Write a protein that binds this ligand. Structure first.
Ligand code: GDU
Length: 363
């Protein structure tokens, strides 16, 4: 058979892991392979030719639900074999694992849950495992080796896989204008965007503080839009307390991210932690200056392209506050950062991930 089985716990269109999966699966499909997907949930369109299997397993604890998932999948595969098994979450029985997550053991070293997630990571990374690993954050490889001793030859570093529709188009100025008209933004207004479905760990709380803390002249001109498949309710108290009710909107998952990237004035991403941060590069290729914490795996790109500022660790609210103020005050610097991002996008390989992953998956 030429069937490839792709395994991920959750498909939905507004996540990095999920979009990377989709691009790899579509590339492998174009190369003559039918696609089977095993998942706990599939939200949104199913592409032609994808055989999507949603597990009927249930458990009160997610970690136990995941083990039941593995048994369910392995029983299906035993009955209906495939050419290769590619997982986007850590579990036993993968031929290939795409490391969309950072090293768990490292995070834990900051009971049933811990043992499950450590055991599933070990199932991939143990030296007796045969799983081949597609890395997307370079910084994580030494940590997997530290914790499991994984052989060097099993790791394959991929370049970024930013989709084409995020690159600034020929009519960028028209898209910007139409966006700003729609949202009621005038030339003297400043729009911050915080993009990604995980507002807490991506530091929406720090973004709101920095917005609140701006000097009066900037604070009056500036608004924030957060975009993600995430609950806004927990931030509403903070927004009211900071007096920002009229300056902040939180939207659900959107498929028109490129319009926000062209229409905004800064991307703010002061994440607590972030394996890579695709949105960081999407801002860069859009010419949108970025303010990001150094812990993000893709932060180095912002620094090296000089397409915004990276805030060094340890995190201090006061430094974020000050950096945001300094970036919004300096319109020449923002114009340079924008130019720098666009020029870097024309030279650097930020696009080829799905082809490279497919080459490794299929030999
Ligand atoms: O409303 C939304 C919100 C997000 N996105 C898209 O979803 C992706 C988000 O990817 P990020 O890496 O920025 O963030 P995630 O947290 O969703 O992604 C996860 O997987 C990534 C790639 O596999 C990285 O490893 C990352 O650190 C990890 O948290 C981007 O293409 C972004 O444009 C949308 O299309 N619509």
């Amino acid at each position: 058979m030429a069937t490839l089985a792709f395994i991920l716990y959750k498909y939905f269109p507004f996540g990095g892991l999920q979009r990377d999966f989709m691009r790899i699966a579509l590339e492998c499909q174009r190369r003559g392979h039918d696609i089977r997907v095993y998942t706990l949930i599939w939200e949104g369109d199913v592409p032609d030719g994808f055989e999507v299997l949603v597990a009927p397993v249930r458990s009160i604890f997610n970690h136990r639900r995941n083990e039941k998932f593995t048994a369910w999948v392995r029983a299906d595969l035993d009955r209906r074999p495939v050419q290769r098994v590619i997982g986007f979450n850590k579990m036993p029985g993968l031929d290939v694992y795409y490391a969309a997550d950072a090293c768990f053991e490292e995070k834990a070293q900051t009971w049933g849950r811990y043992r499950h997630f450590a055991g599933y990571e070990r199932a991939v990374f143990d030296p007796a495992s045969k799983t081949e690993i597609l890395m997307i954050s370079e910084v994580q490889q030494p940590l997997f080796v530290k914790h499991y001793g994984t052989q060097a030859e099993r790791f394959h570093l991929l370049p970024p896989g930013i989709s084409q529709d995020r690159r600034a188009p020929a009519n960028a100025a028209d898209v910007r204008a139409e966006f700003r008209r729609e949202f009621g933004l005038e030339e003297d207004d400043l729009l911050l965007v915080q993009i990604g479905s995980g507002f807490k760990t991506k530091g929406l709380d720090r973004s709101l503080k920095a917005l609140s803390a701006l000097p009066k002249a900037l604070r009056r001109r500036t608004r924030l839009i957060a975009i993600g498949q995430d609950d806004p309710k927990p931030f509403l108290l903070q927004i009211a307390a900071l007096g920002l009710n009229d300056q902040v909107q939180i939207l659900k998952g959107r498929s028109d991210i490129p319009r926000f990237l062209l229409g905004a004035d800064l991307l703010i991403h002061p994440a607590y932690n972030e394996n890579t941060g695709t949105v960081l590069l999407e801002a860069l290729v859009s010419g949108l200056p970025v303010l990001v914490t150094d812990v993000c795996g893709y932060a180095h790109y912002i620094a090296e392209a000089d397409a915004g500022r990276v805030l060094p660790s340890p995190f201090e609210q006061d430094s974020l506050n000050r950096l945001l103020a300094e970036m919004l005050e300096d319109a020449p610097a923002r114009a340079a950062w924008s130019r720098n991002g666009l020029a870097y996008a024309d030279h650097a390989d930020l696009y080829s991930m799905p082809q490279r992953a497919a080459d490794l998956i299929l030999g």
